Structure 1
Amino acid sequence: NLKPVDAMQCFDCHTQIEDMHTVGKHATVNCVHCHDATEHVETASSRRMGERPVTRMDLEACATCHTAQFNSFVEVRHESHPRLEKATPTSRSPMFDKLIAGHGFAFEHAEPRSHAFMLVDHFVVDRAYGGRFQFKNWQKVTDGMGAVRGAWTVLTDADPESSDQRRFLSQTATAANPVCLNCKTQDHILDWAYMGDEHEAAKWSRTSEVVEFARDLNHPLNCFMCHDPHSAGPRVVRDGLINAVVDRGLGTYPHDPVK
């Protein structure tokens, strides 16, 4: 069973978090629900991290207290046809192959399906990783909860001993790069600098080897993408959006300064 930690002690070095956590609707939610910081607290100073504390990115970290929202999220809409190619006469773009010729989407561009699958679908689509990643078998395509538990519980890698983007199947492309993943997961939220710029503190960036990056990512559409875990308040985390709205001054509604 979880044992609460002394959050006040954390706050002696984490004023920024203190100011969010103490005020919001998660003021009573102990840090142990999402962090394992025991060795960190033994080794840190206010100016030296010491041992890096663990931060949980899994959606079940929130499901314990918010099962209704979690279960509603993970539901699979079976009526949303899966792996349905758009470049067919009965889908969105009957002449897509002629029109898009020269682009990687020619290799495959399916209609979207339920959010639970976003990361796995990104990994397995024919245009992304040269067919490197596949469902473990064709039964796994139904397993929304499994995908949410983690991509690598339901997928395989054709060659764990290499990290290069290459084609494993003939009619695939290797369009995936690290930026893609920002719209599939935010497991890397503490390992990626704003915009994916190079940064001494970032394990991952725009220029990383995407296959290596992929292997470190597990969960789709994290709950905290819209909800700050500390304040419980509404937010966004996607760098490109913040860059447009704030950095570039365009605002949240570029056509309506009042709104």
Structure 2
Amino acid sequence: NLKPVDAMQCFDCHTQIEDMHTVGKHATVNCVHCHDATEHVETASSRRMGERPVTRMDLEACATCHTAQFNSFVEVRHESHPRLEKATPTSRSPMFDKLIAGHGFAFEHAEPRSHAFMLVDHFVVDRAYGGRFQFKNWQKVTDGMGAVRGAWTVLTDADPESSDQRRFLSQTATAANPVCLNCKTQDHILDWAYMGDEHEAAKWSRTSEVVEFARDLNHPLNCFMCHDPHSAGPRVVRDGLINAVVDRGLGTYPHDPVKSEQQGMTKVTFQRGREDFRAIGLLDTADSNVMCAQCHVEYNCNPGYQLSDGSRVGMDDRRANHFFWANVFDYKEAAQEIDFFDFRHATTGAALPKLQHPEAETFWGSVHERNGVACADCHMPKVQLENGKVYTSHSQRTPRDMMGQACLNCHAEWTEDQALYAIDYIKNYTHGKIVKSEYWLAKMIDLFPVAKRAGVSEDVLNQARELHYDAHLYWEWWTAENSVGFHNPDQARESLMTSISKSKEAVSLLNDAIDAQVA
């Protein structure tokens, strides 16, 4: 049984917490719910921490008073097929291996599944830790509640005695680095300086041994990623997002200055030894577009190379933790602005970008976004009850499971079948264009070895490599993006037609050059 502490004692030294806690809807929620600070209070001074208080990061710290939201969050959607590789003829990218050759995603790239599994799935995917981590056995793959209780309750480490990234099975990679973890957990929120910069007060940073960092982390998608635990108000905690919206002044809606002002973000900074250490972004409104954009964006969270000179850009560089905050048609400029690319294609040698799940940047400017609809309206709607206290579902999943609330309340002109049909028209059309984009990319790729062995000039090969960058960008955005065009069907169509055009241009260039060598 918890015993309350005198918060006034804390407030003497913690004035930002005072200002947040006393005003919001957690004004009556005692510190003891989330902190054990007895020895801290005995030893702290106004500028020195003394003994470090314990802070609970487990989701159960919130489930005691918010069981409905917690239970809705932890539910496992068994229809979200697990461990399903995307580089197969029946999934999102049938020609992914040929197109991505040279990148670590070639080792494994599965479809997403329920949020409860994000941290464990990050740990066990074949591309991340060389196969070092596994579930304790194959039964544990079902255990969402166990994963939420903590990753290390359901996983095993092949070698607890070493901390290096290395392959434990042959067809694995070691792509994981500490930046990844910021989109899986915020257990490290008090141990990681803003952006992962080096900092005397930070236990972990971009340059940490990721295997050691991994062992310290337990919980997926902490509840406080979207809700300040002190004010209970809406926020983001993801450093990369704050950096794009606030530091770089791009705004919460880069295409809409007015909506950016109405639905903006305020950066709040916390210090260690009176030096800036960490930050949060308080939202003007409970805006799920921005909450979900903590993770559902295109980013750098990895080393890469410079476009200018080809030199390595390591984890120590700020560019290794970067939100581009740019739509598909602005992305190339955004990558040029930081002078960055991800990998060289194994076959063509082209410098290429690697795109990841750009849902937020795709949603901008779409019909639903322009009409003020947000991610939560379709993916975590209010529950409808004949007799009950309404709450917001936290089971972030496809609207197909809750069409009445997610779609039909707005679209009164439609039955469930009609709304599903409309979704499928868009996904079927977009997927057809993704498959055609891959056909043309693959045709271009396969000409590179033919051209090389025919003695085609480097000048021509480099021209084709520049086209490959665009052909790739304007295709991969859409295999990376999870809606198969639904979030912005006209943009997907325009982009995928651009991909095909670029590949066709490269195919013609290489075919002509090969034929001239033969003649």
What's the CA shift for 1:256? 0.3
Moved more, 102-111 or 40-49: 40-49
Task: Say if 2:137 is the partner of 1:137.
Answer: yes
Partner of 1:173: 173
Whole-angstrom distance in 2 between the partners of 1:93 and 1:64 = 42
Whole-angstrom distance in 1 between the partners of 2:49 and 2:95 = 55
Which whole-Å deviations, capped at 9, do the CAs of 1:235-254 have from their partners, x for residues lacking one?
A: 00000000000000100000
Unmatched runs of 5 consecutive residues or more in structure 2: 258-517
What's the CA shift for 1:100? 0.1
Whole-angstrom distance in 2 between the partners of 1:121 and 1:155 = 10
Which whole-Å deviations, capped at 9, do the CAs of 1:148-200 have from their partners, x for residues lacking one?
A: 00000000000000000000011000000000000000000000000000000
Whole-angstrom distance in 2 between the partners of 1:167 and 1:57 = 31
Unmatched runs of 5 consecutive residues or more in structure 1: none
What's the CA shift for 1:67? 0.2
Whole-angstrom distance in 2 between the partners of 1:50 and 1:4 = 21
Q: Secondary structure at the match of 1:160?
A: coil
Identity %: 100
Which whole-Å deviations, capped at 9, do the CAs of 1:17-61 have from their partners, x for residues lacking one?
A: 000000000000000000000010111111111100000000000
Partner of 1:147: 147
What's the CA shift for 1:70? 0.1
Q: Which has the higher contact order (CA 8 A, sep 6+)?
A: 1
TM-score by length of 1: 0.99
Whole-angstrom distance in 1 between the partners of 2:13 and 2:186 = 25
Partner of 2:76: 76
Which whole-Å deviations, capped at 9, do the CAs of 1:64-89 have from their partners, x for residues lacking one?
A: 00000000000000000000000000
Whole-angstrom distance in 1 between the partners of 2:22 and 2:247 = 28
What's the CA shift for 1:223? 0.1
TM-score by length of 2: 0.49
Q: How many residues align?
A: 259
1:219-258 map, 5 Å: 219-257=219-257
Moved more, 42-51 or 126-135: 42-51
What's the CA shift for 1:115? 0.1
Which whole-Å deviations, capped at 9, do the CAs of 1:76-120 have from their partners, x for residues lacking one?
A: 000000000000000000000000000000000000000000000
Whole-angstrom distance in 2 between the partners of 1:13 and 1:248 = 31
Q: Secondary structure at the match of 1:179?
A: helix
Q: Secondary structure at the match of 1:134?
A: strand
Which whole-Å deviations, capped at 9, do the CAs of 1:184-239 have from their partners, x for residues lacking one?
A: 00000000000000000000000000000000000000000000000000000000
Partner of 1:104: 104
Whole-angstrom distance in 1 between the partners of 2:48 and 2:103 = 47
Greater Rg over alpha carbons, structure? 2
1:39-54 map, 5 Å: 39-54=39-54
Which whole-Å deviations, capped at 9, do the CAs of 1:114-157 have from their partners, x for residues lacking one?
A: 00000000000000000000000000000000000000000000
Whole-angstrom distance in 1 between the partners of 2:49 and 2:180 = 30
Cα RMSD of the aligned pairs, angstroms, is 5.2
Whole-angstrom distance in 1 between the partners of 2:88 and 2:5 = 56
Whole-angstrom distance in 1 between the partners of 2:226 and 2:170 = 39
The ranges of structure 1 where at least 4 consecutive aligned residues each deviate by more than 2 angstroms after the TM superposition are none
Q: Secondary structure at the match of 1:116?
A: helix
Moved more, 45-54 or 178-187: 45-54
Partner of 1:11: 11
Whole-angstrom distance in 1 between the partners of 2:13 and 2:199 = 23
Whole-angstrom distance in 1 between the partners of 2:74 and 2:67 = 10
Task: Say if 2:79 is the partner of 1:57.
Answer: no
Whole-angstrom distance in 2 between the partners of 1:42 and 1:244 = 40
